[PDB]
Amino acid sequence: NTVYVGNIDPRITKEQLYELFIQINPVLRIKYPKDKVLQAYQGYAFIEFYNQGDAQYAIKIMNNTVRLYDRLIKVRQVPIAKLFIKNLADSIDSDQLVKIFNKFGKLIREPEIFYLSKLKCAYVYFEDFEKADLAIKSLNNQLVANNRITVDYAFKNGKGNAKYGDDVDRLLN
Amino acid sequence: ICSNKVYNGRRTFERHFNEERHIYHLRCLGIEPSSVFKGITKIKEAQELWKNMQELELEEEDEEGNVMSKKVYDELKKQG
Amino acid sequence: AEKQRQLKLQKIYKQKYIGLGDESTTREQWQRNVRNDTLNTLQGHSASLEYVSLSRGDLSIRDTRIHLLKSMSPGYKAYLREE
Amino acid sequence: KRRKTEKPSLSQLKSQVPYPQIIEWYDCDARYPGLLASIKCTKNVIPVPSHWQSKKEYLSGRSLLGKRPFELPDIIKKTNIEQMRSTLPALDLDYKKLHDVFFKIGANWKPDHLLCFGDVYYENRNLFEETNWKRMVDHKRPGRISQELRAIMNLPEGQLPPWCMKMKDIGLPTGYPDLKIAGLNWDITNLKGDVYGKIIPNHHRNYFGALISFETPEFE
Amino acid sequence: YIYFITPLLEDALTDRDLVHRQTASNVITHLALNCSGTGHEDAFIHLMNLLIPNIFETSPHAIMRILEGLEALSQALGPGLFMNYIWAGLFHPAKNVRKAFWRVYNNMYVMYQDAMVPFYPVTPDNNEEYIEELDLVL
Amino acid sequence: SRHQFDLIMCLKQPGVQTGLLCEKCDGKCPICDSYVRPKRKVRVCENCSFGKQAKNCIICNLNVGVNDAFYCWECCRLGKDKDGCPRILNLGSNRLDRHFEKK
Amino acid sequence: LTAMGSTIVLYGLGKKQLLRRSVTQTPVSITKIVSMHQWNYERLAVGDIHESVTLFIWDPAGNVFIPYVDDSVKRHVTVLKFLDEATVIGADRYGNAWTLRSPPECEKIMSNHDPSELSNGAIKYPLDVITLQQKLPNTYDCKFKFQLLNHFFVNDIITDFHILDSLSNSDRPGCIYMGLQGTVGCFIPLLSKGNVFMMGNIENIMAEADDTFYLDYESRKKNNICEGSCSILGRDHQEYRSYYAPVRKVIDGDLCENFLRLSLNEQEFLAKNLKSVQVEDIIQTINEVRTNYM
Ligand SMILES: [Zn+2]
Ligand SMILES: [Zn+2]
Ligand SMILES: [Zn+2]
Ligand SMILES: [Zn+2]
């Protein structure tokens, strides 16, 4: 629907943008900001079409096409499980963490290694609350690399509430 | 609805209604986006609100088909 | 002084013209004024009175008129219920 | 206390409403919320202008600083008194002229903007830009490019826009199926000036009130 | 002459000064009273649309000039639309908005009653008793 | 009155009698104090007439009026013509501080 | 073509009983349909008890009527007709006789587009209309509005409108209505302008004529008859005929007809307010309507 436009000369005005894009598709709305401090255009606009069909069309035909004031015109189109784990071993690599938690569940992102107190801790992002419950059940208070690690939910207070299972189920759906 | 999240201002929370994550919680929750659900707070009520969000007769030849549906009589076109 | 006069004129206009919503008026108080004025005009115009007479199908038209008059008071519902 | 805490949730109030998106959080403290939802959501009612709950006395507007002092309606500007008396930092004119400007010339004349049934003017709004907008949706049409935007685009005369080549591979605009452009669906020899294409409509009274004559009252 | 006036009142009613808004409303009083029923309501609709936001404006002079202006608009527009505004603001929680609009509705109830009768937004689900005789069709 | 606020009106059902205004107040519509196109003569309730007070100007309440007061065409359409008995019962802070000001 | 309480059903002809060919669900606003009328099978105007007229268009292969215009205000419509494609006659339960017209912004769209694209598909609406959809979804749900065209108040309740292309061979097509309390009256469209200019001036004369008599009778008392003398009753014309909603373009001839009965002294006294033609030509123009227009 709405398309971002950038690399615009502040001398390009609103009527000029309108007359430009009406050549491509019908334009529902144009938001073309105006700096109050400098009393000038900040050189990027937003053109809301009547649908994402004309929007994407204008993205395809318009991108890297029109040359305005010698500068080219650019167009660009415009919640997960988290486990805190404490007392990790210094020999535990982030990739090793990935290998350890892959068997329990798919990771939406990579673990985050940080130090509290000296105390090696990490955040592990699971795509599923139930697979997170698996890595918890098996890995809680367990000894890896000759070091006892604790696996629980990371704080937001901590994840894993009743509404959390309900909505995380839906985000899975 | 958002992580039982905390907001320090009412203007800001009124800005939460249009946001990436807030709409992700709605749409991924099965409650579709935009402007009907703006006043949402708890996850529960907007579920019944979204449940609140979501006979033609084609005359067969025996003259009993005056109760018979359009698509049904088309199926009997493919059968006939 | 000026607003204070507007209070007195509020008392006078309310006295003459009966219901005038001042600031806080209960829905029971105001809706009663609505019903009273609507019925008032239905029976007031011989036109709309003749109309309601036929559409209702009463035997006489004054039955409809005095019906509306009676219908202005709240207890008339229970009165019909007791017939 | 108890009445303040007795209030139903706004979402509980939404279900009673056929158009639930108008109701807002403050309607929870409506002393008669089930009624106020019905009135506010009734068909033709026009919601209260929202400048209430702001203490700014409805105009603090920064935009108010930059508003033009005034502009004469062009029909009155024809009367030339603009030059006769300088308002910016004797003047006798013809009775027939002025009278005809209001009546002969300006009988059918009407302000271009006005407003609609439910139009309400909020502080930050300025009608003028929307007037040039509505007038512009009128004048400007696809296939035509003004000489100013053409010069900025650096497109010389007789040459097609750069999106005609990508429009050759991608195809005509989905929004304009009837659009014609020289060299492709439309005759290149008809390329003239600022118009490289035009929409060809495929569609091809008296309104019981047709006056059939127009006669204004004469001053003399 | 009404149409040539409205672009002037455009900058008047919009002006920040409560004085200009006041005297402009005084224009709308006489202009609306003597031009009422001519068929310019579409222009009167505009002129009003600029007035409604000024209802909340305080001070005695501003409030009475604006009240008289809106009452003049009641005659040129007719209650129905003027009502529609008054209705959508009629109760409201704000204790202030309410006190303000019930002034306009008081004056409207004074000048017009039968005139407002058809225009009450009242339905059987809106109020309990309603009136059984409004739905009768022959 | 339209201008002076503290002035109080009567607003009773007008009688057959016609209110008088002095030559000094002549020409004012007793509600809006307008000089243009007057229409209908004012009528006051009997309670505002009786004795000497009947001769007073219904507007300024002090002087003895010869002329009849008429409502304008704007008040006759606004219906304030039929609102009630116009009269000014209290003399008003303006006239008061005027009299005490001079003497 | 029948109207349920909520919805509009279009029945065909079946045998042993009649069948539902199509059903159209109403907008939420419409509770019941008192009366409705069609324009050349393409268009409809559907009335309500509580709310006002709403026009629909029949879309073939869409098998549905699509509302393309709302109405401005709440009006209780007893009987309704079409003068034209774009305009509608309607009466009220309370006695208002009005006529509405679709805006040219809508007429351009429907003249330039097919109805099938209204419900679904691409129809390009100016920026203001959409902003009125998200801003005021309740009123602008039908995305257009009837600008009031004619409004009038006849104290009766109009039963039947009929639009006659000619009344006794007369050129100007009239619309004649019979009221419930009984009456028959007509609205004649005036060709040209100075017709409605002269008529308007005569109505303006007879409107305050009672006041003019009162001011003359007042001045002669200043040098030496109540106010309602000529009207016999206090009601002004514009006030009485305005009533519920102000008369818009309709000039009332039933008033100008009273000018005929007044004595020559009174008539010549009234017509002096005009620089225009004499009383005799006045009476000419007045009596012209019944002769020529029907
Ligand atoms: Zn949220
Ligand atoms: Zn008195
Ligand atoms: Zn005096
Ligand atoms: Zn007056």
PDB file of N, CA, C and O in Angstrom, chain G residues 99-148:
ATOM      1  N   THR G  99     -36.801  16.732  -1.688  1.00  0.00           N
ATOM      2  CA  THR G  99     -36.210  16.129  -2.873  1.00  0.00           C
ATOM      3  C   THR G  99     -34.700  16.221  -2.748  1.00  0.00           C
ATOM      4  O   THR G  99     -34.168  17.296  -2.459  1.00  0.00           O
ATOM      5  N   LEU G 100     -34.009  15.109  -2.978  1.00  0.00           N
ATOM      6  CA  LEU G 100     -32.570  15.034  -2.771  1.00  0.00           C
ATOM      7  C   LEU G 100     -31.883  14.697  -4.080  1.00  0.00           C
ATOM      8  O   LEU G 100     -32.519  14.190  -5.010  1.00  0.00           O
ATOM      9  N   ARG G 101     -30.587  14.969  -4.148  1.00  0.00           N
ATOM     10  CA  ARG G 101     -29.799  14.745  -5.345  1.00  0.00           C
ATOM     11  C   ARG G 101     -28.429  14.202  -4.970  1.00  0.00           C
ATOM     12  O   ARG G 101     -27.804  14.671  -4.015  1.00  0.00           O
ATOM     13  N   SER G 102     -27.991  13.230  -5.698  1.00  0.00           N
ATOM     14  CA  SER G 102     -26.646  12.704  -5.535  1.00  0.00           C
ATOM     15  C   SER G 102     -25.624  13.742  -5.979  1.00  0.00           C
ATOM     16  O   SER G 102     -25.868  14.482  -6.935  1.00  0.00           O
ATOM     17  N   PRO G 103     -24.477  13.833  -5.315  1.00  0.00           N
ATOM     18  CA  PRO G 103     -23.505  14.864  -5.661  1.00  0.00           C
ATOM     19  C   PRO G 103     -22.841  14.566  -6.992  1.00  0.00           C
ATOM     20  O   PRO G 103     -22.705  13.397  -7.391  1.00  0.00           O
ATOM     21  N   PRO G 104     -22.422  15.607  -7.717  1.00  0.00           N
ATOM     22  CA  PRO G 104     -21.725  15.381  -8.989  1.00  0.00           C
ATOM     23  C   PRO G 104     -20.468  14.547  -8.842  1.00  0.00           C
ATOM     24  O   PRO G 104     -20.075  13.869  -9.799  1.00  0.00           O
ATOM     25  N   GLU G 105     -19.822  14.578  -7.674  1.00  0.00           N
ATOM     26  CA  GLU G 105     -18.668  13.717  -7.447  1.00  0.00           C
ATOM     27  C   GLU G 105     -19.058  12.251  -7.545  1.00  0.00           C
ATOM     28  O   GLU G 105     -18.288  11.424  -8.046  1.00  0.00           O
ATOM     29  N   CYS G 106     -20.253  11.910  -7.072  1.00  0.00           N
ATOM     30  CA  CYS G 106     -20.748  10.550  -7.230  1.00  0.00           C
ATOM     31  C   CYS G 106     -21.249  10.280  -8.641  1.00  0.00           C
ATOM     32  O   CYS G 106     -21.007   9.191  -9.176  1.00  0.00           O
ATOM     33  N   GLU G 107     -21.928  11.247  -9.261  1.00  0.00           N
ATOM     34  CA  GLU G 107     -22.434  11.035 -10.614  1.00  0.00           C
ATOM     35  C   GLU G 107     -21.311  10.807 -11.617  1.00  0.00           C
ATOM     36  O   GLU G 107     -21.461   9.996 -12.536  1.00  0.00           O
ATOM     37  N   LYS G 108     -20.191  11.514 -11.469  1.00  0.00           N
ATOM     38  CA  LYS G 108     -19.047  11.263 -12.339  1.00  0.00           C
ATOM     39  C   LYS G 108     -18.541   9.839 -12.169  1.00  0.00           C
ATOM     40  O   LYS G 108     -18.230   9.153 -13.151  1.00  0.00           O
ATOM     41  N   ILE G 109     -18.460   9.373 -10.922  1.00  0.00           N
ATOM     42  CA  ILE G 109     -17.911   8.047 -10.660  1.00  0.00           C
ATOM     43  C   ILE G 109     -18.819   6.970 -11.238  1.00  0.00           C
ATOM     44  O   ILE G 109     -18.359   6.051 -11.927  1.00  0.00           O
ATOM     45  N   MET G 110     -20.123   7.070 -10.983  1.00  0.00           N
ATOM     46  CA  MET G 110     -21.009   6.030 -11.489  1.00  0.00           C
ATOM     47  C   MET G 110     -21.227   6.129 -12.990  1.00  0.00           C
ATOM     48  O   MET G 110     -21.495   5.109 -13.634  1.00  0.00           O
ATOM     49  N   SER G 111     -21.116   7.322 -13.562  1.00  0.00           N
ATOM     50  CA  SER G 111     -21.192   7.442 -15.009  1.00  0.00           C
ATOM     51  C   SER G 111     -19.946   6.886 -15.680  1.00  0.00           C
ATOM     52  O   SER G 111     -20.031   6.352 -16.790  1.00  0.00           O
ATOM     53  N   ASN G 112     -18.793   6.997 -15.027  1.00  0.00           N
ATOM     54  CA  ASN G 112     -17.522   6.591 -15.606  1.00  0.00           C
ATOM     55  C   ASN G 112     -17.087   5.193 -15.186  1.00  0.00           C
ATOM     56  O   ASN G 112     -16.040   4.723 -15.644  1.00  0.00           O
ATOM     57  N   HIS G 113     -17.852   4.515 -14.334  1.00  0.00           N
ATOM     58  CA  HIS G 113     -17.449   3.211 -13.836  1.00  0.00           C
ATOM     59  C   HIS G 113     -18.625   2.249 -13.871  1.00  0.00           C
ATOM     60  O   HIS G 113     -19.788   2.652 -13.934  1.00  0.00           O
ATOM     61  N   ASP G 114     -18.297   0.958 -13.831  1.00  0.00           N
ATOM     62  CA  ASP G 114     -19.280  -0.116 -13.771  1.00  0.00           C
ATOM     63  C   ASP G 114     -19.607  -0.436 -12.324  1.00  0.00           C
ATOM     64  O   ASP G 114     -18.725  -0.341 -11.460  1.00  0.00           O
ATOM     65  N   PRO G 115     -20.852  -0.804 -12.022  1.00  0.00           N
ATOM     66  CA  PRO G 115     -21.213  -1.093 -10.625  1.00  0.00           C
ATOM     67  C   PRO G 115     -20.436  -2.243 -10.013  1.00  0.00           C
ATOM     68  O   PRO G 115     -20.239  -2.260  -8.791  1.00  0.00           O
ATOM     69  N   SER G 116     -19.984  -3.203 -10.824  1.00  0.00           N
ATOM     70  CA  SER G 116     -19.287  -4.367 -10.289  1.00  0.00           C
ATOM     71  C   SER G 116     -18.020  -3.992  -9.539  1.00  0.00           C
ATOM     72  O   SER G 116     -17.571  -4.754  -8.676  1.00  0.00           O
ATOM     73  N   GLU G 117     -17.437  -2.833  -9.842  1.00  0.00           N
ATOM     74  CA  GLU G 117     -16.188  -2.455  -9.198  1.00  0.00           C
ATOM     75  C   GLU G 117     -16.429  -1.728  -7.881  1.00  0.00           C
ATOM     76  O   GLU G 117     -15.475  -1.454  -7.144  1.00  0.00           O
ATOM     77  N   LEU G 118     -17.688  -1.409  -7.568  1.00  0.00           N
ATOM     78  CA  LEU G 118     -17.972  -0.678  -6.338  1.00  0.00           C
ATOM     79  C   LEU G 118     -17.759  -1.548  -5.107  1.00  0.00           C
ATOM     80  O   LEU G 118     -16.992  -1.185  -4.206  1.00  0.00           O
ATOM     81  N   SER G 119     -18.433  -2.700  -5.051  1.00  0.00           N
ATOM     82  CA  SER G 119     -18.331  -3.572  -3.886  1.00  0.00           C
ATOM     83  C   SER G 119     -16.904  -4.067  -3.701  1.00  0.00           C
ATOM     84  O   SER G 119     -16.289  -3.862  -2.649  1.00  0.00           O
ATOM     85  N   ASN G 120     -16.364  -4.720  -4.723  1.00  0.00           N
ATOM     86  CA  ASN G 120     -14.973  -5.133  -4.733  1.00  0.00           C
ATOM     87  C   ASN G 120     -14.373  -4.693  -6.058  1.00  0.00           C
ATOM     88  O   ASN G 120     -15.076  -4.546  -7.061  1.00  0.00           O
ATOM     89  N   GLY G 121     -13.070  -4.497  -6.056  1.00  0.00           N
ATOM     90  CA  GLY G 121     -12.377  -3.967  -7.209  1.00  0.00           C
ATOM     91  C   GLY G 121     -11.931  -2.533  -6.980  1.00  0.00           C
ATOM     92  O   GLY G 121     -12.139  -1.941  -5.918  1.00  0.00           O
ATOM     93  N   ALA G 122     -11.311  -1.976  -8.012  1.00  0.00           N
ATOM     94  CA  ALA G 122     -10.611  -0.702  -7.917  1.00  0.00           C
ATOM     95  C   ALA G 122     -11.529   0.424  -8.376  1.00  0.00           C
ATOM     96  O   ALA G 122     -11.881   0.505  -9.557  1.00  0.00           O
ATOM     97  N   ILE G 123     -11.908   1.287  -7.439  1.00  0.00           N
ATOM     98  CA  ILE G 123     -12.562   2.559  -7.726  1.00  0.00           C
ATOM     99  C   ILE G 123     -11.819   3.638  -6.958  1.00  0.00           C
ATOM    100  O   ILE G 123     -11.712   3.566  -5.729  1.00  0.00           O
ATOM    101  N   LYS G 124     -11.317   4.637  -7.674  1.00  0.00           N
ATOM    102  CA  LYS G 124     -10.441   5.635  -7.077  1.00  0.00           C
ATOM    103  C   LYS G 124     -11.287   6.815  -6.618  1.00  0.00           C
ATOM    104  O   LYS G 124     -11.823   7.567  -7.438  1.00  0.00           O
ATOM    105  N   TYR G 125     -11.405   6.965  -5.345  1.00  0.00           N
ATOM    106  CA  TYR G 125     -12.082   7.986  -4.563  1.00  0.00           C
ATOM    107  C   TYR G 125     -11.107   9.077  -4.145  1.00  0.00           C
ATOM    108  O   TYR G 125      -9.973   8.778  -3.753  1.00  0.00           O
ATOM    109  N   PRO G 126     -11.521  10.338  -4.240  1.00  0.00           N
ATOM    110  CA  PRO G 126     -10.661  11.438  -3.789  1.00  0.00           C
ATOM    111  C   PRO G 126     -10.286  11.278  -2.324  1.00  0.00           C
ATOM    112  O   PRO G 126     -10.958  10.597  -1.544  1.00  0.00           O
ATOM    113  N   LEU G 127      -9.182  11.931  -1.958  1.00  0.00           N
ATOM    114  CA  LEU G 127      -8.593  11.744  -0.635  1.00  0.00           C
ATOM    115  C   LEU G 127      -9.592  12.046   0.475  1.00  0.00           C
ATOM    116  O   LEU G 127      -9.572  11.411   1.535  1.00  0.00           O
ATOM    117  N   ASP G 128     -10.476  13.016   0.247  1.00  0.00           N
ATOM    118  CA  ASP G 128     -11.385  13.446   1.303  1.00  0.00           C
ATOM    119  C   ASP G 128     -12.366  12.343   1.674  1.00  0.00           C
ATOM    120  O   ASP G 128     -12.684  12.157   2.853  1.00  0.00           O
ATOM    121  N   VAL G 129     -12.849  11.595   0.680  1.00  0.00           N
ATOM    122  CA  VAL G 129     -13.876  10.590   0.940  1.00  0.00           C
ATOM    123  C   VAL G 129     -13.350   9.515   1.882  1.00  0.00           C
ATOM    124  O   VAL G 129     -14.013   9.145   2.860  1.00  0.00           O
ATOM    125  N   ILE G 130     -12.149   9.005   1.610  1.00  0.00           N
ATOM    126  CA  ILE G 130     -11.574   7.965   2.458  1.00  0.00           C
ATOM    127  C   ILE G 130     -11.340   8.496   3.865  1.00  0.00           C
ATOM    128  O   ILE G 130     -11.700   7.855   4.860  1.00  0.00           O
ATOM    129  N   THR G 131     -10.750   9.689   3.969  1.00  0.00           N
ATOM    130  CA  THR G 131     -10.560  10.300   5.282  1.00  0.00           C
ATOM    131  C   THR G 131     -11.881  10.474   6.016  1.00  0.00           C
ATOM    132  O   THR G 131     -11.905  10.489   7.251  1.00  0.00           O
ATOM    133  N   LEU G 132     -12.986  10.613   5.283  1.00  0.00           N
ATOM    134  CA  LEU G 132     -14.288  10.618   5.934  1.00  0.00           C
ATOM    135  C   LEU G 132     -14.730   9.205   6.283  1.00  0.00           C
ATOM    136  O   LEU G 132     -15.590   9.015   7.151  1.00  0.00           O
ATOM    137  N   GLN G 133     -14.158   8.197   5.622  1.00  0.00           N
ATOM    138  CA  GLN G 133     -14.492   6.821   5.979  1.00  0.00           C
ATOM    139  C   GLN G 133     -13.819   6.409   7.281  1.00  0.00           C
ATOM    140  O   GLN G 133     -14.469   5.867   8.181  1.00  0.00           O
ATOM    141  N   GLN G 134     -12.510   6.657   7.411  1.00  0.00           N
ATOM    142  CA  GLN G 134     -11.865   6.330   8.681  1.00  0.00           C
ATOM    143  C   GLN G 134     -12.202   7.350   9.757  1.00  0.00           C
ATOM    144  O   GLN G 134     -12.298   6.993  10.938  1.00  0.00           O
ATOM    145  N   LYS G 135     -12.381   8.614   9.385  1.00  0.00           N
ATOM    146  CA  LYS G 135     -12.744   9.613  10.381  1.00  0.00           C
ATOM    147  C   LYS G 135     -14.165   9.421  10.890  1.00  0.00           C
ATOM    148  O   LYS G 135     -14.377   9.352  12.106  1.00  0.00           O
ATOM    149  N   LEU G 136     -15.142   9.319   9.996  1.00  0.00           N
ATOM    150  CA  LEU G 136     -16.547   9.203  10.384  1.00  0.00           C
ATOM    151  C   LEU G 136     -17.146   7.994   9.689  1.00  0.00           C
ATOM    152  O   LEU G 136     -17.877   8.121   8.699  1.00  0.00           O
ATOM    153  N   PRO G 137     -16.863   6.793  10.189  1.00  0.00           N
ATOM    154  CA  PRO G 137     -17.377   5.591   9.520  1.00  0.00           C
ATOM    155  C   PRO G 137     -18.882   5.445   9.610  1.00  0.00           C
ATOM    156  O   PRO G 137     -19.481   4.826   8.724  1.00  0.00           O
ATOM    157  N   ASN G 138     -19.516   5.990  10.649  1.00  0.00           N
ATOM    158  CA  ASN G 138     -20.952   5.790  10.808  1.00  0.00           C
ATOM    159  C   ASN G 138     -21.756   6.569   9.773  1.00  0.00           C
ATOM    160  O   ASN G 138     -22.666   6.015   9.149  1.00  0.00           O
ATOM    161  N   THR G 139     -21.440   7.848   9.573  1.00  0.00           N
ATOM    162  CA  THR G 139     -22.210   8.652   8.630  1.00  0.00           C
ATOM    163  C   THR G 139     -21.814   8.345   7.191  1.00  0.00           C
ATOM    164  O   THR G 139     -22.674   8.153   6.326  1.00  0.00           O
ATOM    165  N   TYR G 140     -20.513   8.283   6.920  1.00  0.00           N
ATOM    166  CA  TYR G 140     -19.981   8.174   5.568  1.00  0.00           C
ATOM    167  C   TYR G 140     -19.796   6.729   5.120  1.00  0.00           C
ATOM    168  O   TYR G 140     -19.127   6.479   4.113  1.00  0.00           O
ATOM    169  N   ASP G 141     -20.320   5.768   5.886  1.00  0.00           N
ATOM    170  CA  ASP G 141     -20.252   4.364   5.487  1.00  0.00           C
ATOM    171  C   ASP G 141     -20.658   4.178   4.026  1.00  0.00           C
ATOM    172  O   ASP G 141     -20.046   3.384   3.301  1.00  0.00           O
ATOM    173  N   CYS G 142     -21.673   4.914   3.570  1.00  0.00           N
ATOM    174  CA  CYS G 142     -22.112   4.782   2.183  1.00  0.00           C
ATOM    175  C   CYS G 142     -21.290   5.657   1.247  1.00  0.00           C
ATOM    176  O   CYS G 142     -21.647   5.806   0.073  1.00  0.00           O
ATOM    177  N   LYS G 143     -20.255   6.315   1.773  1.00  0.00           N
ATOM    178  CA  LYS G 143     -19.161   7.014   1.071  1.00  0.00           C
ATOM    179  C   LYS G 143     -19.630   8.208   0.249  1.00  0.00           C
ATOM    180  O   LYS G 143     -18.786   8.929  -0.300  1.00  0.00           O
ATOM    181  N   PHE G 144     -20.931   8.446   0.136  1.00  0.00           N
ATOM    182  CA  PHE G 144     -21.413   9.706  -0.413  1.00  0.00           C
ATOM    183  C   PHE G 144     -22.576  10.179   0.443  1.00  0.00           C
ATOM    184  O   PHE G 144     -23.043   9.472   1.339  1.00  0.00           O
ATOM    185  N   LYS G 145     -23.056  11.379   0.134  1.00  0.00           N
ATOM    186  CA  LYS G 145     -24.108  12.022   0.903  1.00  0.00           C
ATOM    187  C   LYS G 145     -25.001  12.813  -0.034  1.00  0.00           C
ATOM    188  O   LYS G 145     -24.526  13.400  -1.009  1.00  0.00           O
ATOM    189  N   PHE G 146     -26.292  12.825   0.269  1.00  0.00           N
ATOM    190  CA  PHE G 146     -27.215  13.664  -0.480  1.00  0.00           C
ATOM    191  C   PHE G 146     -27.118  15.103  -0.010  1.00  0.00           C
ATOM    192  O   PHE G 146     -27.390  15.409   1.154  1.00  0.00           O
ATOM    193  N   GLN G 147     -26.733  15.990  -0.917  1.00  0.00           N
ATOM    194  CA  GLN G 147     -26.878  17.414  -0.678  1.00  0.00           C
ATOM    195  C   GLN G 147     -28.361  17.726  -0.781  1.00  0.00           C
ATOM    196  O   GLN G 147     -29.030  17.289  -1.725  1.00  0.00           O
ATOM    197  N   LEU G 148     -28.889  18.425   0.217  1.00  0.00           N
ATOM    198  CA  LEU G 148     -30.291  18.796   0.177  1.00  0.00           C
ATOM    199  C   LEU G 148     -30.544  19.651  -1.054  1.00  0.00           C
ATOM    200  O   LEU G 148     -29.812  20.608  -1.319  1.00  0.00           O
TER     201      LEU G 148
END
